[PDB]
Design a protein around this nucleic acid. Structure first.
Ligand code: A1CHB
Ligand code: ZN
Lengths: 766, 459, 746
DNA sequence: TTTTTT
């Protein structure tokens, strides 16, 4: 009663067959039981073992009981001799699509056609290429062919049939192990892949990082799990030489044993703060105890009486030209005694340097020449004022009427106390409290405090630019801000380990401005720490940003609204970059406080009347009897993604020199640049004949000097493109094959070309 | 041999979703009756047309040009019941080539042939009647009625002519490079499906099954354009349109009815990009990431002068892309150097057709002097072409001529992504260093899709 | 029948330098003697000399100079209104001129000696000094003095200074000012000059807004100080009777000016005005207006001085600061004047011998030596040190160490070799300049004023005659050889030094001190006696008997470079550090930090494996660096403290165009330029010449990220030497300034 | 500017 499923192609030629007998046990069959039954079925000597034979999206009948019929069936099944019409009647594509190998031609044709759907299992849903790959890793011992007939020496079906029937991958252990090995390999592979995809999907769903970080992450993680070496070792592990399952040579796979050791090992690093700080930030602090702490404070923080209420302003407030001239006039009274001559970036740099300069004893400070008072005490804040229609009016002040600016949002102690009695809460109470809320003339309309790298930063001021899918309710925003407070305080207690930040009493301050919910979050730097450096606060911002997208409450609250999960901008901390102060507008939205009371705040009225003190929202404010002071002056430099650092490590390990080293090939600033200019002169005549005789006699002069970008202005320059004022430049970077990327660039001072933007014209090899 | 592994083991969840999407029986009342398509024939203008829902399902397969989505289509064909179609004849033949390279695939035709598009429909007024959608929120019935009013001059003719097709034997319709089809077609296909299963009373119609449209294509490397010709001004205009992919991804009504969250597969990896840098450029381009200084310096190494690309003596054997058909007509010429009908129609007009007289591509990109690829079933040089046509087929060596001011970063991404290797790529200017109109709306939608637990990413 | 008087000569100045008729190669020079008799009464006297061309070319060292050139220079200097500041053209010319006129004065007339009794004669028929003889009777009057303060605002145009500094880059800015007055003498006519000469009899003060104009404030009179004397003379050069006006300095003798803010232009202008005022009336000869000083040369000079080569004939001594011991330096200047006849430090090395007679004396001294030293002189290459010393990375202790020095060995050896070549000199009477050097050497231990003279006369003499260096360093090499030979006998072991100064160890048990003094004294005795015996055998005889100085006993000694040595006696905690550059006020604090860190790190002799000690030493060195940079912050605004003294030889920062506006402050710059590197704006570090701007200074914050790096560099040099010298080598102590504690300043 | 369906 042995049942055979046979594929034929015209006397009948049978070239693939699956023999099976109905299992008399309910659930008796095991893998080794099936292997024994199959090895018994396919006779090792040749043919089958039964007495009577019934021979018959799906990929694809005669009885045999008399002696002649069964003899003919054995002859046609073990050798390949065609079955004549009498026996039945009384009762290149294949070589192409089923592998060139004999193993494939027999075993894969048997499985994919006559064995896949009948036996069920996962292999029923796998394609021909997948099944051929599985056959390729089914690397059972290979004995030589007795007739040495090659698999490609086959023309008709009388050859393919003879090859398959007299093969030793067809009538024994291999023919019995292949169906079981398909199931085993798939099971082992899915065990590892499904685990890796569980990790992938979870980390993807809870990442809450910037758009650019996400891309690197998905790609790199997919590479670790699926990469040439990882996939190769995994398939080598599943490789079996013994078809017998008991002694199969397949062991657990190295994949899912190296990723969980390499990157997925630290996939749970960005997944949890405490591991994001340990592995991504390198803290560099320097303790300073004694009079040196007091010294460092005054030297690197706004003077005590500079952010304290004063009746009228006192400082230099003027437009760009009027302050450019006044700065030069001040230098004319400053040069006689030491200040070198400086023969809108230069003005801001000079003003910041003037403000930073400290007082030497009772002598009036250096900025007193510009501010024109002897009561001025440095260091000082420097602000930028945008006016109408335009004009960046820089203003350096020694004191200002901040009481007047914050008067509108100042709530009397009686009011706050009465609201506290009406609403004894911290979430519903802040709700009620918030609901209850010429260069000289423009000073009190628009200010933008300008970062001074010389001074020490005392407040973590984060600019939260929230993007919105649709309008939001205030209560959801206030709850999200409470969650943000929680996450930021966890991140702060992680960054500053010797501080004491109780995340129910530590005051965080919040200010809010169809487009965006403009937010500003101000945090006191906990004592005894002071943060120094633009890059250090950049790192603090990255830690806070990747810590707030870890708290499930924040993402659950605001997640359905934020189109891009990036909230914190980290580019407002460079030297000379301005940030819009709270209690100020933009020339369209006056930043006003939104009160998120600490859950265990012991002084609510103080917290409310703490948002009106300028010190709470100034980068280099005076810190509010210091014994010890710890200056976090580095939290690690360039914050190469904790991922792309591995993508920088994997960049070479898989793909494969800096500009300076490449310059070594050319024996290496203006000298070699003029040699490259000689090559440019020859080609510029042909490429642009209208200005051919212009750059023939120009001199290279380095204007921009970067590690991988040396730009040299070609001071003698009519624009080559959009021929009509323009400046020509010579770029220097890395070429295609680690060469010299020398580019001709014609920045144009006209409207047609992007004004003051650098453009490229041709890049030639060197 | 390990290259296929990720696809092999990640297409299985896709296969284990399309099956239930295709074996879901509809309620008896929701099945579009024959009388519906009888009334549609009776209707003359697409105004009194009744609001009628035509149920359908989708499964979206998206990714880069060489992402390997073709492996997903291959696995689908050999395992599932399916009618594989294509948005263009070239794409249909490309799929046939890649499906017959593994097993048997029946002759793959275009979706247009499948729903009965014939010769007279080619030049048909496909944008005439108006529609004020009683919407916001837009009901699916209103969207389908808009897409039927859009194609009234095609839907009506198909219904009238109908009142054996391959739509009678399967409910899984794979449309490859479906971004080359406009949104009007999506509803149309579903509509036509029900037609061909109602007149013939197919066993699927008795089983109350509904169409599932497996749309495979690149959403940020492909666009669909609609051309209308004004018959007095003789000004043929071509506006941009919403493709099927963008319609499905960006419409809140379709993203809910079709449940794109549980029905979306993004193929994420290229397999011909041997340049960390070329790959990184393609990544910044297909995702909308901020353009940094480093990217500008990288693409700086490709810029070669305007008079270097256009000169035929340079870059021999390099395909040159322009952003204007007149520009190609100029460059090809330079390279070579190196009664009753018009009586009655004039009567009816109350008072450029060379392009609208044959295959547009070669008709407006020819100087006929030759020096090639067959266009129709009409030869093209394959040496110079437009960026918009370049979307269809990949190229070996590419020199891009960019017109300033008309710079669209999607055009730059399409032009730069036609070649496998960044080594063989030259350009007029730097698209990253010049003013470019970037439209990063579908980019954030893919990004939010890459940020969803129910979307299947295949590496 | 010659007149005879009794007087002491207080000064000798140059009045006239003329070329007589029928003369081609010999010029006569008239010398003004400011003689004073007993009880101070002063009578002016005059003498004549006759210098030949050969003598001029000998005292110049080259034949480029000629008699015509000297006479032209003297004629130009005759008038100060037309052209003052004559020496600035060829300072060597006037230097040699004074040298030869003094030599001829010594030769023809006889032996002269300032502030000393001298019998003087005169010939009435002609009316000049004829012969000077040393007398031996009289308690001569004390060399009285007068305190002079003079300040002038000579409105020099800055751009001229900038241009003249551009022609010669490393031109000391006092030379720039002085050249500006020389090229525009009218600038010396308009200046707010104020003068106050206080004497013991009567004070005199004048104030001017314009120099030529009458005073806007008077006090006393010109006549109280000066007794204008008209004296008739009949020189052999001038047959006709020639009358000379001289400014006899009644009441006082020499001037005493504070060197703190001394302005050579100020005194030049005041003396030019006096010259114009006195010699305005004709009928008499005009004197020479010549002055020399370190401000008169492009590259400057070490020791402040103001020579008076002519008018008014009164020596003026600049005594720089030193308020605590002002009388001591005034006496030192007076002694230096009296001994070296006032040529020092203006004439230079020619006080001893002509610059060109030295090539003969050195050769004549290479012959009288012993045969071995004869070759030893000829094989001397710069810094040979042919003696068994220690490897520069090395340290010793605990063993009884000791430093020794021969006080003034180069000067004494030069004197002995000069006597060896004395027989080879052309003129036995031309050896009087060889009597001043012996007077200096003999009086060197008794009085320190001879010291500073000998520490500059000798190195400059060695530059006048390059061949004398190979002789002096060969004689000293021979001395070191016998030092090493005798050392073994007395348990001494040569371990390092530089010749005259040498430090070594003792092979005595390192715990006993009662017998330590005995061996340390016997070694000194034996080494001194043996070196004296070698010198005597080498024929070289020293005027002052040789003496060895025990400059300290120490137990530990560590050396890193060839000059850097630190010694420490644990018992009394007395230490000594050498080789650390004191290039400013911060380097002294660095030296103190180093001498405390080394005292603490060699106190770690507690029994430990050598590996442990290296780490517990490096930790302490890093901690010392930390405590230094912490204290550096509390003085970040003291730019003068963070200042470096650049020499006119070293590469220097470029002068800002506003430092050329210091007024009466550019004159103070003679040798050193004190520069502080400040950081204006960002990125750029610019140098500020501190002493060329008025005080209090206003500056951008001082770039301590540059000065502290160099101070730390030399600290790590010392610390790497000690770390790799006491314990196992292989450790270059580096302090991560750029990371650990860079934030404080940058 | 702008392809594509028979
Ligand atoms: C070292 C490394 N190597 C990696 N691999 C194999 C790739 O980047 C391969 C590739 C290259 C081009 C495309 C691509 C193509 C497009 F048409 C559009 C967008 C695209 F991204 C996708 C994949 S990934 C990494 S990492 C930095 N993730 O560690
Ligand atoms: Zn331009």
């Amino acid at each position: 009663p042995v049942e055979v499923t046979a594929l034929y192609a015209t006397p009948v030629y049978i070239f693939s067959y699956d023999a099976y007998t109905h299992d008399g046990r309910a659930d008796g069959p095991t893998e080794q039981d099936r292997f024994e039954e199959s090895r018994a079925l396919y006779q090792a000597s040749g043919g089958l073992n039964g007495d009577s034979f019934r021979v018959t999206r799906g990929r694809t009948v005669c009885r045999f009981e008399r002696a002649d019929d069964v003899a003919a069936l054995q002859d046609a099944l073990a050798h390949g001799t065609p079955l004549q019409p009498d026996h039945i009647a009384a009762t290149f594509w294949f070589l192409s699509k089923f592998g060139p190998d004999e193993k494939s031609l027999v075993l894969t044709t048997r499985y994919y056609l006559l064995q896949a759907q009948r036996l069920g299992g996962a292999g029923a849903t796998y394609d021909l290429q997948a099944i051929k790959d599985i056959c390729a890793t089914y690397a059972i011992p290979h004995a030589p062919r007795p007739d040495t007939v090659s698999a490609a020496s086959l023309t008709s079906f009388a050859a393919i049939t003879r090859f398959c029937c007299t093969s030793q991958y067809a009538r024994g252990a291999a023919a019995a192990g292949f169906p079981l090995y398909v199931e085993r390999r798939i099971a082992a592979d899915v065990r590892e892949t499904s685990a890796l995809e569980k990790f992938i999907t979870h980390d993807r769903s809870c990442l809450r990082v910037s758009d650019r970080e996400f891309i690197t992450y998905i790609y790199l993680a997919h590479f670790e799990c699926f990469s040439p070496p990882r996939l190769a070792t995994h398939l080598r592990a599943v490789t079996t030489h013994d078809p017998n399952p008991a002694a199969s040579t397949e062991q657990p796979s190295p994949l899912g044993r190296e990723a969980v050791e390499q990157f997925f090992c630290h996939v749970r690093a960005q997944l949890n703060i405490g591991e994001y700080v340990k592995h991504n930030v390198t803290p560099r602090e320097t303790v300073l105890d004694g009079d040196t702490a007091k010294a460092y404070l005054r030297a690197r923080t706004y003077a005590p009486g500079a952010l304290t209420p004063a009746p009228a302003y006192c400082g230099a407030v003027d437009s760009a030209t009027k302050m450019m001239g006044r700065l030069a006039d001040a230098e004319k009274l400053l040069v006689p005694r030491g200040w070198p001559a400086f023969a809108t970036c230069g003005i801001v740099k000079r003003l910041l340097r003037l403000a930073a300069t400290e007082q030497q004893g009772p002598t009036p400070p250096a900025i007193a020449a510009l501010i024109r008072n002897a009561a001025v005490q440095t260091p000082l804040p420097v602000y930028r004022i945008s006016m109408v229609p335009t004009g960046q009016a820089f203003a350096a002040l020694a004191w200002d009427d901040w009481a007047r600016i914050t008067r509108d949002a100042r709530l009397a102690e009686a009011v706050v106390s009465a609201e506290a009695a009406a609403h004894p809460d911290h979430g519903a109470l802040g709700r009620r409290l918030t609901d209850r809320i010429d260069a000289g003339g423009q000073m009190y309309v628009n200010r933008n405090e300008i970062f001074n790298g010389a001074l020490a930063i005392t407040n973590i001021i984060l600019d939260l630019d929230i993007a919105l899918k649709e309008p939001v309710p205030f209560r959801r925003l206030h709850e999200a801000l409470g969650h943000f407070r929680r996450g930021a305080l966890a991140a702060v207690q992680l960054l500053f380990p010797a501080a004491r930040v109780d995340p129910d009493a530590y005051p965080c301050y919040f200010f809010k401005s169809t487009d965006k919910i403009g937010l500003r979050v101000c945090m006191p730097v906990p004592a005894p720490y002071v943060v120094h450096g633009s890059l250090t606060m950049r790192g603090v911002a990255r830690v806070i940003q990747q810590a707030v997208l870890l708290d499930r409450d924040f993402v659950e609250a605001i997640g359905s609204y934020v189109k891009n999960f990036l909230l914190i901008d980290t580019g407002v901390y460079a030297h000379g970059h301005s940030l819009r102060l709270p209690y100020f507008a933009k020339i369209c939205g006056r930043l006003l406080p939104v009160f998120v009371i600490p859950p265990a705040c012991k002084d609510v009225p103080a917290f409310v009347a703490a948002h009106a003190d300028p010190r709470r929202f100034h980068f280099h404010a005076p810190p509010t009897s210091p014994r010890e002071i710890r200056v976090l002056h580095s939290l690690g430099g360039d914050y190469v993604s904790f991922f792309e650092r591995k993508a920088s490590r994997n960049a070479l390990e898989h793909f494969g020199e800096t500009l300076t080293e490449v310059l070594g090939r050319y024996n290496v600033v203006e000298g070699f640049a003029s040699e490259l200019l000689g090559r440019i002169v020859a080609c510029i005549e042909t490429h642009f004949p209208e200005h051919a005789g212009e750059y023939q006699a120009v001199s290279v002069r380095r204007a921009v000097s970067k590690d991988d970008w040396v730009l040299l202005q070609l001071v003698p320059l009519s624009c080559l493109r959009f021929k009509h004022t323009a400046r020509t430049f010579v770029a220097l970077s890395v070429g295609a094959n680690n060469r010299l990327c020398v580019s001709l660039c014609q920045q144009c001072f006209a409207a047609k070309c992007d004004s003051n933007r650098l453009h490229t014209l041709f890049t030639i090899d060197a | 041999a390990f290259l296929n592994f990720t696809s092999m083991h990640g297409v299985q969840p896709i296969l284990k979703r399309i099956r239930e999407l295709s074996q879901q029986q509809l309620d008896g009342a929701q099945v579009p009756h024959l009388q519906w398509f009888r009334d549609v024939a009776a209707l003359e203008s697409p105004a009194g047309l009744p609001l009628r829902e035509f149920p359908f399902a989708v499964y979206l397969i998206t990714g880069n040009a060489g992402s390997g989505k073709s492996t997903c289509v291959q696995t689908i064909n050999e395992v599932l019941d399916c009618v594989v179609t294509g948005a263009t004849r070239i794409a249909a033949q490309n799929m046939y080539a890649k499906l017959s390279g593994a097993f048997l695939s029946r002759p793959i035709n275009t979706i247009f042939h499948e729903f009965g598009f014939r010769g007279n429909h080619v030049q048909a007024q496909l944008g005439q009647y108006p529609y004020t959608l009683t919407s916001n929120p837009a009901s699916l019935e209103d969207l389908q009625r808009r897409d039927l009013t859009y194609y009234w001059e095609v839907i009506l003719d198909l219904t009238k002519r109908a009142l054996l097709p391959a739509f009678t034997r399967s409910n899984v319709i794979v449309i490859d490079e479906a971004g080359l089809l406009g949104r009007h077609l999506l509803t149309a296909v579903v509509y036509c499906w029900w037609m061909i299963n109602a007149l013939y009373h197919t066993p699927q119609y008795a089983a109350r099954l509904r169409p599932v449209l497996v749309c495979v294509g690149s959403p940020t490397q492909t666009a669909s354009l609609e051309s209308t010709f004004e018959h007095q001004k003789l000004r043929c205009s071509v506006r941009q349109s919403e493709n099927v992919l963008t319609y499905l991804i960006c419409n809140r009504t379709l993203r809910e009815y079709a449940r794109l969250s549980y029905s979306w597969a993004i193929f994420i990896n290229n397999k011909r990009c041997v340049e960390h840098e070329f790959g990184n450029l393609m990544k910044v381009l297909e995702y909308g990431l901020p353009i940094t200084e480093e990217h500008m310096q990288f693409v700086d190494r490709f810029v070669v002068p305007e008079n270097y690309i256009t000169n035929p003596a340079n870059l021999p054997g390099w395909t040159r892309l322009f952003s204007s058909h007149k520009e190609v007509s100029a460059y090809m010429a330079k390279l070579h150097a190196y009664v009753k009908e018009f009586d009655e129609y004039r009567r009816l007009t109350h008072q450029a057709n060379a392009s609208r007289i044959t295959n547009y591509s070669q008709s407006q990109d020819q100087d006929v002097t030759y020096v090639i690829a067959v266009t129709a079933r009409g030869i093209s040089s394959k040496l110079a072409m437009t960026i918009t046509r370049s979307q269809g087929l990949s190229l070996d060596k590419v020199a891009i001529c960019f017109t300033p001011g008309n710079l669209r970063l999607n055009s730059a991404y399409v032009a730069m992504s036609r070649t496998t290797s960044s080594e063989f790529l030259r350009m007029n200017l730097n698209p990253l260093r010049e003013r470019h109109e970037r439209d990063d709306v579908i980019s954030e939608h893919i990004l939010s899709a890459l940020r969803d637990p129910n979307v299947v990413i295949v590496y | 029948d010659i007149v005879w008087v009794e007087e002491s000569v207080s000064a000798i100045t140059l009045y006239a330098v003329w070329l007589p008729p029928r003369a081609r190669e010999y010029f006569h020079a008239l010398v003004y003697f400011v003689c004073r008799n007993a009880a101070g009464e002063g009578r002016a006297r005059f003498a004549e000399v006759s210098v030949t061309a050969t003598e001029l070319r000998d005292f110049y060292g080259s034949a480029d100079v000629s008699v015509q050139a000297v006479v032209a220079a003297a004629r130009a200097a005759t008038t100060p209104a037309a052209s003052p500041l004559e020496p600035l053209e060829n300072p060597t010319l006037w230097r040699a001129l004074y040298a030869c006129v003094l030599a001829a004065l010594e030769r023809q007339t006889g032996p002269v000696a300032l502030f000393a009794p001298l019998r003087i004669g005169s010939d009435p028929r002609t009316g000049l000094v004829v012969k000077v003889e040393r007398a031996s009777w009289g308690p001569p009057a004390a060399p009285r003095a007068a305190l002079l303060v003079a300040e002038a605002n000579i409105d020099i145009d800055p751009m001229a200074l900038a241009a003249r500094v551009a022609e010669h880059p490393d031109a000391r800015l006092a030379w720039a000012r002085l050249a500006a007055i020389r090229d525009t003498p009218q600038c010396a006519s308009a200046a707010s000059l104020t003068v106050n000469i206080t004497t013991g009899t009567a004070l005199f003060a004048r104030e001017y807004q314009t120099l030529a104009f009458p005073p806007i404030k008077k006090e006393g009179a010109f006549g109280d100080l000066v007794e204008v004397c008209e004296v008739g003379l009949r020189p052999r050069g001038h047959p006709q009777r020639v009358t000379a006006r001289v400014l006899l300095p009644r009441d006082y003798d020499y001037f005493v000016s504070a060197g703190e803010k001394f302005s050579a232009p100020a005194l030049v202008a005041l003396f030019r005005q006096w010259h114009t005022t006195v010699h305005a009336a004709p009928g008499a000869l005009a004197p020479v207006f010549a002055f020399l000083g370190p401000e008169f040369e492009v590259r400057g000079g070490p020791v402040p001085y103001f020579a008076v080569l002519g008018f008014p004939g009164w020596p003026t001594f600049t005594v720089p600061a030193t308020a605590e011991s002002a009388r001591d330096l005034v006496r030192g200047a007076a002694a230096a004047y009296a001994a070296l006849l006032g040529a020092w430090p203006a004439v230079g090395a020619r006080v001893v011998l002509p610059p060109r007679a030295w090539p003969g004396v050195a050769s004549a001294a290479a012959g009288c030596l012993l045969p071995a030293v004869r070759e030893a002189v000829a094989r001397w290459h710069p810094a040979t040190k042919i003696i068994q010393l220690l490897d520069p990375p090395a340290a010793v202790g605990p063993v009884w160490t000791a430093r020794f020095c021969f006080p003034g060995l180069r000067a004494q050896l030069l004197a002995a070799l000069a006597d060896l070549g004395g027989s080879g000199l052309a003129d036995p009477h031309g050896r009087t300049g060889l009597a001043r050097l012996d007077a200096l050497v003999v009086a060197a231990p008794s009085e320190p004023w001879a010291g500073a003279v000998l520490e500059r006369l000798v190195p400059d003499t060695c530059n006048a005659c390059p061949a004398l260096r190979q002789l002096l360093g060969g004689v000293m090499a021979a001395v070191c050889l016998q030092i090493e030979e005798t050392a073994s006998s007395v348990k001494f072991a040569v371990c390092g030094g530089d010749g005259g100064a040498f430090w070594g160890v003792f092979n005595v048990d390192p715990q006993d001190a009662d017998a330590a003094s005995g061996v340390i004294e016997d070694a000194r005795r034996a080494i001194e006696t043996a070196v004296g015996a070698v010198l005597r055998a080498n024929a070289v005889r020293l005027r002052h008997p040789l003496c060895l100085a025990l400059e300290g006993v120490y137990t530990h000694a560590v050396a890193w470079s060839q000059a850097g040595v630190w010694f420490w006696n644990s018992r009394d905690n007395t230490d000594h550090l050498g080789g650390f550059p004191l290039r400013g006020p911060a380097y002294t604090t660095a030296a103190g930090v180093v001498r405390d860190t080394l005292r603490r790190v060699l106190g770690l002799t507690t029994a430990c494996v050598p590996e442990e000690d290296a780490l517990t030493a490096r930790g302490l060195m890093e901690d010392a660096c930390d405590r230094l940079i912490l204290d550096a912050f509390n003085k970040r605004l003291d730019a003068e403290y963070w200042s470096v003294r650049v020499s006119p030889f070293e590469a220097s920062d470029p002068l800002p165009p506003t430092a050329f506006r210091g007024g009466a402050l550019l004159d103070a710059e003679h040798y050193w330029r004190r520069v502080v590197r400040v950081c204006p704006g960002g990125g750029e570090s610019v140098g500020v010449p501190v002493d060329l701007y008025p005080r209090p200074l206003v500056l951008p914050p001082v770039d301590c990220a540059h000065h502290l790096r160099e101070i730390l560099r030399e600290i790590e040099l010392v610390f790497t030497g000690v770390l790799a010298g006491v314990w196992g080598e292989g450790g270059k102590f580096v302090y991560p300034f750029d990371d650990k504690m860079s934030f404080l300043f940058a």
